[PDB]
């Protein structure tokens, strides 16, 4: 996250860190039930040197605050039994950039570990709404990755504006969230984490999955996120949640 601040400890108890063994923190995820996380499909694509698609390569940390303190009280360590990437995921366009991760053992709910709420398929996150992005990604483009979880407040951008800012790149699964002026944005290593939206009684719903951007925090280049409501039924079908 560029332009953000240190989160308070336990502030985002649905934010999860995914480490690939020997590679450190690679992406974020969100806790949605005792057994399931939502993340970004593009995080789990093999390259010639590492099989990111193999669930056995991964560790999820729940209740994590500081990457240098992974054994701190209340942090829960879990393996993955399965990665379900969206069948329509495209590694060139990043369309359908969403995956479901099955924990090998259930999370224990606590003050530090709590699921985010899922929005119904009919819910619209309106243009202009303030939303929060969180993660341990870079704090400057080409920069480096934060030890302490970062938070930044960003706003939903109108889809037509989004399409025009990033021509031939924005599908209806995608949403721009940020500022046309730049300044606050997700960045490398934030991929897969949740957008957190404060809803009508203060409960927090997931409004998206961190996906991609052109640089970070640049003018006219807000971050791109996978939308959540359109995947509500897909989530239910595949997880029971
Ligand atoms: S909608 C998901 C979260 N709800 C809960 O954690 C309460 C029910 C639990 N499933 C349980 O302990 O049984 C939630 O409200 N998260 C968002 C928030 O703002 O806290």
């Amino acid at each position: 996250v560029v332009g953000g601040t240190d989160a308070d400890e336990g502030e985002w108890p649905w934010q999860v860190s995914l480490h690939a063994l020997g590679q450190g923190h690679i992406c974020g995820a969100s806790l949605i039930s005792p057994n399931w996380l939502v993340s970004a499909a593009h995080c789990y694509i093999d390259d010639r040197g590492f099989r990111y698609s193999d669930p056995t390569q991964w560790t999820a940390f729940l209740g994590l605050h500081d990457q240098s303190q992974r054994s701190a009280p209340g942090v829960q360590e879990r393996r993955l039994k399965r990665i379900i990437s969206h069948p329509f995921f495209n590694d060139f366009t990043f369309d359908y950039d969403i995956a479901l991760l099955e924990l090998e053992k259930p999370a224990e709910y606590s003050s530090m570990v709590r699921p985010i709420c899922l929005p119904d398929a009919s819910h619209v996150f309106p243009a202009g709404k303030a939303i929060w992005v969180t993660g341990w990604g870079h704090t400057q483009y080409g920069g480096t990755g934060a030890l302490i979880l970062q938070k930044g407040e960003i706003r939903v951008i109108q889809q037509t504006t989004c399409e025009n800012l990033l021509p031939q790149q924005i599908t209806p699964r995608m949403m721009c969230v940020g500022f046309l002026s730049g300044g606050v944005d997700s960045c490398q290593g934030d991929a897969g984490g949740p957008l957190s939206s404060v809803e009508a009684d203060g409960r927090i719903f997931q409004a998206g999955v961190v996906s991609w951007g052109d640089g970070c925090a640049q003018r006219n280049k807000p971050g791109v996120y996978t939308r959540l409501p359109l995947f509500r039924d897909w989530i239910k079908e595949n997880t029971g949640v």
Side-chain angles (χ1 to χ4, degrees):
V1 182
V2 183
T5 58
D6 289 0
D8 298 334
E9 211 192 348
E11 188 176 20
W12 308 100
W14 36 87
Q15 173 75 54
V16 179
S17 169
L18 271 288
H19 282 229
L21 181 62
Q23 302 298 131
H25 169 92
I26 299 299
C27 288
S30 61
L31 183 70
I32 60 159
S33 77
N35 301 108
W36 287 97
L37 320 177
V38 170
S39 187
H42 84 254
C43 295
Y44 309 100
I45 300 306
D46 294 347
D47 68 27
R48 61 172 161 278
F50 199 92
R51 204 168 298 273
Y52 292 103
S53 70
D54 176 357
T56 74
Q57 307 288 301
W58 291 93
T59 300
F61 294 96
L62 304 101
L64 186 69
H65 184 66
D66 182 337
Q67 288 291 342
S68 68
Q69 301 294 325
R70 300 194 299 268
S71 292
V75 182
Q76 294 172 36
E77 180 180 356
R78 294 290 188 277
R79 299 298 183 244
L80 302 186
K81 50 180 157 171
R82 179 162 43 149
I83 297 165
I84 303 174
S85 293
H86 199 286
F88 306 152
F89 173 69
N90 180 336
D91 203 48
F92 183 78
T93 59
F94 274 28
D95 202 7
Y96 291 92
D97 191 11
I98 188 168
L100 303 162
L101 316 180
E102 190 178 6
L103 300 176
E104 187 271 329
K105 182 279 172 197
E108 177 181 340
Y109 292 175
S110 72
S111 58
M112 297 294 258
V113 177
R114 180 181 177 91
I116 191 164
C117 301
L118 291 172
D120 284 349
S122 61
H123 184 72
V124 168
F125 294 99
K129 194 169 186 305
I131 302 289
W132 291 83
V133 61
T134 53
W136 292 274
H138 293 180
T139 60
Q140 284 275 282
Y141 180 73
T144 333
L147 293 179
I148 297 173
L149 182 65
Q150 300 294 293
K151 60 179 181 188
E153 189 176 24
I154 47 171
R155 293 191 181 269
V156 177
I157 289 160
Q158 289 182 46
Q159 193 79 171
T160 297
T161 299
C162 186
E163 290 159 2
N164 292 345
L165 294 172
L166 297 155
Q168 310 324 308
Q169 294 164 86
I170 300 300
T171 78
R173 275 56 67 188
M174 295 173 193
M175 176 175 53
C176 288
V177 194
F179 300 98
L180 282 253
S181 53
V184 185
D185 203 357
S186 64
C187 204
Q188 191 185 130
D190 293 322
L195 291 177
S196 291
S197 179
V198 178
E199 291 297 325
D201 58 2
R203 287 192 316 144
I204 289 169
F205 283 70
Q206 185 162 351
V209 185
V210 187
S211 181
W212 67 271
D214 183 1
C216 306
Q218 297 316 297
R219 182 178 56 87
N220 294 323
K221 298 172 172 319
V224 188
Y225 298 82
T226 304
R227 291 175 179 273
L228 248 306
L230 64 149
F231 296 107
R232 187 66 187 88
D233 291 344
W234 181 70
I235 293 168
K236 178 76 182 281
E237 184 52 46
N238 285 268
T239 71
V241 178

